[PDB]
Symmetry: D2
Subunit: 513 residues, 4 copies
């Protein structure tokens, strides 16, 4: 009568649906990471403490706005609030810090507003004499290569898709367009080129400086904007360089080229953000659910983290409760298989930052139980390469074992995170407690569905066996304290055959002491 | 390269997901019916003509507010806009008319009105509640827990705080308010008088509530379909009996989400859709699907998600409420549901869906079901432009829709009501033949099949030379559908 | 409770196995064609009538031995016996005649041994193995007819004898040829060429008998009309423990292509001397039908055995029991997944008809057909229900026994003036056939497949009708 | 690619068939146990040594015939043959001894259509003529109704009951034949009330205990109570001797479930079953029984006429090679030889053949859907031993391990791995001689008997035995240094503490 275990037993997906039960309560542990954008609503130490207690695992800093000193104080506040729980490692929740880059943009110049008439002509010019003299006849852009990347018939969107232009003739340093969808044109408006291969650099002058700030500020991950190809990922990696080699690169897929070149992008990245906001400007909004499900599926298939983002609980900016469409959207992202779900304006500037978080947490947990693990696991098992790698064999064996005995947890010792990530890719129902002494591994582990990172602070015991056991019991204490299991329950424990990374090979079924 | 047919051939659901392709265009035909609430924004004859052109199939009138005269004029305006396309039967689109009842409510002015004492109109509340039981006021704004129950008094402690005549909900309680209120009685009579196609019955909690709506409609209303609106915990609990007694179901998410934790609504939705899909009865997903478009010309990303996932869940019909009744952009809201539903329909994993549906398809001796399922399999085999079905009552085409073909079901009928009510079923495009009955029956049959051919051609569903499936029967009258033919479009 | 219908509902194959029930009786109809080799035991007119009554659908004639006069009289007697039933076309059973060729061969003191294959040095290398006298002797091994395991033997597609034997077959109006020792597609094209234009409608069934035939199976299947799993010679060429792999591989690939596959040799071998078979033999027959063989075969069991008739009756009993035990639920799911979205109306009609038949558990699928093609298309999707194929073409009726499920029936009535009534006549003929044979009764639902006009290629109409 | 791993990857069963490849060679290990009936052709110590080297795992003694003295000597010879290899424990193969009971029987020119009286009057106990026939089953009338069939001399003659008395029955002959003396009588569809064990059986069973047999094949089991009675005869002294119930008639098939639950395993006794039931239905009974045994996780034996022609011929028929293959594909834990090894001209060849076929068929199993299904039809219990076992089998698939190595005192931990039907061989390491012999009943279990003394450091004692397993697999040719294998151990000594799985290289 709990955790949708009746529906879990259904031999078909239809009967699985039919069995979903509002009176079947979930478990305590919530497996989907919650990423919260920080802003004036949620930036104080006191409000960040409650953000943490409400379920925030990752603090997102949006670098489209705010100075470096502004962002350094946000990061300070986040760390002050996070370490205010440090005294008891058993309860301490790690919180990661994500730097989301502004990235390359196309801006128009100065106009004050002009009215564009649907069906009228408008000329785009790269001639800087019209740079501060834009009007309903002539509009200047700052993308000096635009003529090389568009064709007669190509569409140009101005001000987050509000205005739609179609190129009717191309010149030298100008294009002549017809206004499809008119409206009020303004100054300094964002511009998108649906379907174009935009040749703006992978990282802007500003991103370059912001990225190097992220290294100095010891950020855990970068959300890299407007990634269109693998070479763009490689430039971000290169800018972060040697000292930033362990910072995770999440590519943001925000346009048609990124969706189409997705495979090469995913290969080069540590993870992916389905940036639905900008993506639904670049592509028809009715197609966005296809790109989301395709991307979640392919990341799931590759074992790489995927984040569903933007407007998930949007009304909660003004109202203390979501719309039904919004709660549907969060549940369905989890059902699709997103590792993480994201809050933007709902936490940064909204009237109800805490309710928004607490709601993603309630929905995430309800949806995690509603997942059809029976076919999910079968398909991932079917789709799993037969290879000699002992660490993979061990990971899959532990997930199989966890389903067999419906265990309270899969406990994993990990230095880098990788052994825990390997378990997460098989989508166990039980929560993965990733015991680590590496504080960065513990913060970054939040990117993966099911992983519950715990930061062990005990000294290394001189007998290695004792030291392993010490960390395994730390994990049992965390599970007991957090209410994931109780003394007598069975849990699965993963360890390796010598110290250091890459030797995970040992799966035990143990009672909770 | 089209209609997500690469994704359709995937051996696993996971691969099916991976193959979903924004560069793969859908077909013209949209299978999921669109139900539009009519109100001040959409009531004019001119606007309704555009609602129809945009894709509205059913006009919902909400009898929570409005005079009978107001509603009578709305219905009249819907019929004028509809019949203004009647001159060409090939392009004529039927539009049904749905009456959505106010239903039983609890209202404020806890005795049986200030910070101290509050008065409620529901007199049997003390018998239905217990100590610890929760009471919500003004659409779940305020929350109350009873600390002591008395004769005509409840003593509560307020949980969440923050007016006159406000709505009360009593979560997890068996409310004994009558099936059909005093105002409901008058309104169902008006529904009969005005020839409504369907009643959407509010706050159905059990089978006997549907039987009461059925009894009130009685012999004069015996062809009006009853769609039970599930809006509270009891109606989720007692869903199986309610479904058995009903002609279809509305997932009334608005109120449902006041009654149960907002985070559980997707479970109740997916359960009711799956179970209606299993039973072959129409299911409507309702409420706040494109809510932001009341004030904005474009929806949030979570809103287009919700509409797509509703279609993927298996809903026969989707709904708009304030979005089309009173918002600033009603035609846009309609057009947006048409676009998404169409994308999502291509995205369904028909391969497993059809597999699982027929694995429940009973081995009855019934020839009509055997013919229906053969036709759907044949439609998958040749990827047909359409399944064309001659039906008097709709039943023959309902039986095809039950197996969820990819191809559109052109249901040809001479019955105007049959044509309007077919919209409740995923994939049915009802066309109303007006040609006289031919002397020879065989010629009469062929005349309506050719009518359907011309409709599909005129709507861009198929062109000369394509292959379609045609379902007919061996003799006149309902219940004899037994003949499936694979024919080319002339 | 009948026809293993409880087991048929199992959602898994393990549970399907667990529900198989010896108290669940099969239907009357037996879908798997039985092919009988004729010799001294089974060549008299008297014995042949009983072979037919017992369930013989095809008369195999082994041209490894016998003169043209000998074989001429066997065929004469098979036709005499077959046509002794023609008086009532409702109960008359067509019987096909298959010519099985001798094929190319390698033939032969302890000091020096001579063989007749001139290119043997080129085709073999030091380390290669040579078997003599049906694998009884081995050379590089085993002391105590030459086979070249795993070698590309360049003997001709057909010998000189094969050419006049096929010529004789054309003269004698045989329905099919079982071509021996097929190694490549070009061998099949040679048999096709020799048969020529006058023998254009004679079906070529390739006998797969060696490691090269197996490795090159796909080009061979494409070029043939069907396949024989010739387990005898194939078990000499390859290790006998590997023969079931080859059998199942070929049956699977044949079902995948929708072409007839025959399982042959030693199926009921002990019944040459004994009146009933061993448990291994009963198991072999049942499993060949479960594998998906269109036809099963008897050689010495019927050619020279003491119990020819008991060997036929026993195959009939087992095949009928095994047909019920097939896990149709997944078989049909897989066939329908493994078949393409074509624009071909007849294919959509065929598959919809089989779908319908499962849905109402119909007593038959009745199909009018001139060439047999419309019925072949239906049999490809492996329906539980028997396929009553009505044809006016006697060659079509006789060749239709190659396909699982097809009960071919030859309509003798003249063509009716109006086409509508002509079709109804043949549909009623099918109804009368089914009732007389006990396949179904009045009130039962059947599926009926017709076209929209006369001539082949226009099958487009499926109807679900009660038996009148 | 080897052991049909291309076919192993097929998304469908049809495609799996289509990929089966004769040029894909098996692994060296062979998982299906082989039971050989020992008789005049296989009794010698020297012949038995070669039987063992050919692949005999279990020596079956049929007590239908032969004295206690004769059978005692057969056992002695099997043990002398078996222990001749005991010098090297790495190459030593355990061999089990199974006692097959005679069971409850019914014993006595007939023209078809003629009348025949079946009388129970002992006056005619030696005057069995064509007119009147005597039987030794006094209750036969109790369980005979008008219309019942009666078979005589292993189904050679058939009769139907037309009139009924108490001492007699008026039959008419269906299938005529030559009626001999003291021939076997079967009653199809009858609820025969003969005891679970005859007087002779009770003696032979107690002799079984005296002789320390590993298992009993109990003839003619028709109901749960029959199995309990066999269990009561073996008593506390024979409490560890495994009871394999022989399913030989309609009643046992119909009541299979209650019989399965009480037994330690099942024999599909095809010979006698095909006299009781129409021969064409036996394959249904076999598949039903193997499936349900697979589902219950209890060993099932396929038996009788599998390589029958090899009694006289050095090579089998195509139908016989097919039959052995299909039994393995069905999921039979063990395959059996009777006359082929007991009395035939080619006993060693019959064993080597079943060995060659078994191995091929084992590669040709569709593990993908087999393990999927086993795992779906599989309870969620708090049992850590079951969860470790399933995790090891999944791990073995994921990395295509060369073996699953399991330490087991009682055999239970290895039985639990074997029930998930891994492709990889289960090398079960035990110090318990009876555990090692009885483990042969289970598909995939290769028992090895460790005879090192118990090390004072238990961690070392555990590792000693894992390394012993490594040495066996290298010597046997199951794998080699650098190959990855799965190792199953427990957290403390004694049964029921298996909980540790490790993926490791062969050293
Ligand atoms: O779906 P229903 O109500 O059973 O109607 C289907 C009927 O339509 C027909 O195709 C034509 O019937 P009519 O000519 O009376 O309209 C019948 O053969 C068939 O029984
Ligand atoms: O299987 P075939 O050779 O295509 O024949 C099927 C034909 O049989 C028919 O049902 C009847 O045709 P005929 O009248 O020419 O015999 C046709 O409609 C159809 O095309
Ligand atoms: O299969 P069983 O009978 O449970 O035996 C498994 C046992 O074997 C062991 O690995 C070793 O046990 P011993 O040292 O007592 O032989 C235990 O850890 C484990 O419980």
């Amino acid at each position: 009568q709990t955790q949708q275990l009746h529906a879990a037993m259904a031999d078909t997906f239809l009967e699985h649906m039919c069995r979903l039960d509002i009176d079947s309560p979930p478990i305590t542990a919530r497996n989907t990471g919650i990423i919260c954008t920080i802003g004036p609503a949620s930036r104080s130490v006191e409000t960040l403490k409650e953000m943490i207690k409400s379920g925030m695992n990752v603090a997102r800093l949006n670098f489209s706005h705010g100075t470096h000193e502004y962002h350094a104080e946000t990061i300070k506040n986040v760390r002050t609030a996070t370490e205010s729980f440090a005294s008891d490692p058993i309860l301490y929740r790690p919180v990661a810090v994500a730097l989301d880059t502004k990235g390359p943009e196309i801006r128009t110049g100065l106009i004050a507003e002009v009215e564009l008439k649907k069906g009228a002509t408008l000329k785009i010019t790269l001639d800087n004499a019209y740079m501060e003299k834009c009007d309903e006849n002539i509009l200047w852009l700052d993308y000096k290569n635009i003529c090389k990347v568009v064709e007669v018939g190509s569409k140009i969107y101005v001000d987050d898709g509000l205005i739609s232009l179609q190129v009717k003739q191309k010149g030298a340093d100008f294009l002549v367009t017809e206004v499809e969808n008119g409206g009020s044109l303004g100054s300094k408006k964002g511009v998108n080129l649906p379907g174009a291969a935009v040749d703006l650099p992978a990282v802007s002058e500003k991103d370059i400086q912001d990225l190097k700030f992220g290294v100095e500020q010891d950020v855990d991950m970068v959300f890299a904007s407007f990634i269109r190809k693998a070479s763009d990922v490689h430039e971000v990696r290169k800018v972060l360089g040697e000292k930033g080699k362990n910072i995770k690169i999440i590519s943001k897929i925000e346009n048609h080229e990124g969706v189409r070149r997705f495979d090469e992008i995913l290969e080069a990245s540590d993870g992916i953000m389905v940036a639905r906001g900008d993506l639904g400007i670049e592509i028809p909004a009715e197609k966005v659910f296809l790109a989301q499900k395709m991307m979640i599926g392919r990341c799931n298939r590759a074992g790489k983290p995927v984040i569903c983002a933007t407007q998930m609980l949007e009304s909660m900016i003004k109202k203390p409760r979501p719309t039904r469409a919004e709660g549907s959207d969060v549940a369905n992202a989890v059902l699709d298989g997103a590792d993480c779900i994201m809050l933007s304006g709902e936490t940064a500037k909204g009237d109800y930052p805490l309710e928004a978080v607490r709601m993603q947490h309630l929905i995430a947990r309800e949806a995690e139980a509603a997942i059809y693990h029976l076919q999910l696991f079968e398909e991932l098992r079917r789709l799993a390469p037969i290879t000699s790698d002992p660490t993979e064999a061990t990971a899959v064996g532990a997930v199989e074992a966890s389903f067999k005995c419906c265990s309270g947890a899969i406990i994993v010792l990990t230095k880098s995170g990788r052994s825990a990530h390997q378990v997460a890719r098989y989508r166990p129902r039980a929560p993965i407690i990733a015991v680590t002494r590496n504080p960065q591994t513990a913060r970054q582990a939040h990117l993966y569905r099911g992983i519950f990172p715990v930061l062990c602070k005990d000294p290394v015991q001189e007998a290695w066996a004792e030291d392993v056991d010490l960390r395994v019991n730390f994990a049992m204490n965390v599970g007991k304290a957090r209410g994931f299991f109780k003394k007598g329950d069975v849990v699965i424990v993963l360890t390796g055959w010598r110290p250091g990374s890459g030797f995970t090979n040992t799966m035990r079924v143990v009672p909770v002491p």
